[PDB]
Amino acid sequence: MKEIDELTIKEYGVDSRILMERAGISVVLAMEEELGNLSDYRFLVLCGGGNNGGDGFVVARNLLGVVKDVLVVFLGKKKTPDCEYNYGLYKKFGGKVVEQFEPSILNEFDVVVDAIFGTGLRGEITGEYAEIINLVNKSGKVVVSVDVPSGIDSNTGKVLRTAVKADLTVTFGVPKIGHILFPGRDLTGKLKVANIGHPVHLINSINRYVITREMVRSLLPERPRDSHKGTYGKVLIIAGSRLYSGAPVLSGMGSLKVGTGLVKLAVPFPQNLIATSRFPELISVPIDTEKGFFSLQNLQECLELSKDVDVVAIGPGLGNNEHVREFVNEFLKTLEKPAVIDADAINVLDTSVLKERKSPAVLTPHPGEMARLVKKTVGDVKYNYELAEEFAKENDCVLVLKSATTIVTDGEKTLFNITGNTGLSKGGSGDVLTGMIAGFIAQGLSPLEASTVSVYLHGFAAELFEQDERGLTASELLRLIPEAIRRLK
């Protein structure tokens, strides 16, 4: 996007000042859309010495004479050329700038416009910068951030010591990764993305996107009227154990609720009977195990059952002991079908196995499982989209790294999911998503497409829960999936 600005100026020939005017006015229009008529409000505009601050001076100058009061506090040392030009306009138009503030300044103002730092933030915020940001955050005023809330790293969404908490963020061209990943996503408040006149071809070239309703709608498979269950594919789910009997059931229904034609579970006996007592639609094959866990003695039966399906999901509730490890790795090494690998199948996975598979795979770890899989800490893998991309590319798979914002990548293309809520922060949620992904693969979507559609719909179904989200359970999530699908079109 910094490249996009440069090219728009240097090669398309758009004056940098025109881009800056467009940025500033889009902030004014956004505020009006959010606050209604601006003419009764008093505005405090906090401007750094960079182009973010220059955008701020455009905002300030365009409010002059139209609102009750504008004051700029200029907090920088020097001004870039466009900031200087726009400071110069603000002052020629009759604007008041001050370079010092007292804590009390917030008193006489209703709206704070945060134009201190944008994408040019480098390093921790300290000093007077930190102090004014902490004062703004304690003030209870309406906060509108220009491009990115000051103090968020726009490439990662991390807080560099302290950051502005905004009610409204107006960003230019495209959302930045720091509006999408937490904590930055939280501090952004309501995000508007403004067109400031970059060529559309450049805006569209960005390789990391947010999954949108329109993208998911165009990916949803067709339901031709002359069809039968075989049209919509077959899934095998290898799951469960004497310890974890519920997982298979949630995974299986997850596949059925997204429109899969036939779902078969392989679950240790008698835990397999659990599934059909709850949903008799499912086929739940009993697997005879020595001690209630899959082992090498079940390898052959599982490969046999795989022959008549389009996709296999494995892992939810398997347990993690050595016999499971041997079974999972020998199975995946021989299985020549797409595989969705989750939960305990990830915990025991030998990643060499993925490199040697000819068939595709999707892996669906939470950060704890991803951390163990690559032998790093949770903090180092959490929201680490570049690590996710490298892993996907090196192992020839799709990686779905689950969190409040979920990252979906095949190594080339990376998509971010922002649907969902904390009702999914509860056992069983993941098991549903595994089934959804397998289901969409069975219906003919690529592993990446299936993952993109499933993460979006899984979170959207959660948002449709009628009562308080903290009471959402996986069973209720399942019931909501077909309403999510309907609302999507």
Binding site: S26, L29, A30, E33, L191, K192, V193, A194, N195
Partner: peptide, 8 residues
Amino acid sequence: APAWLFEA
């Protein structure tokens, strides 16, 4: 719904 200026 008109979206020349803003995407939500």
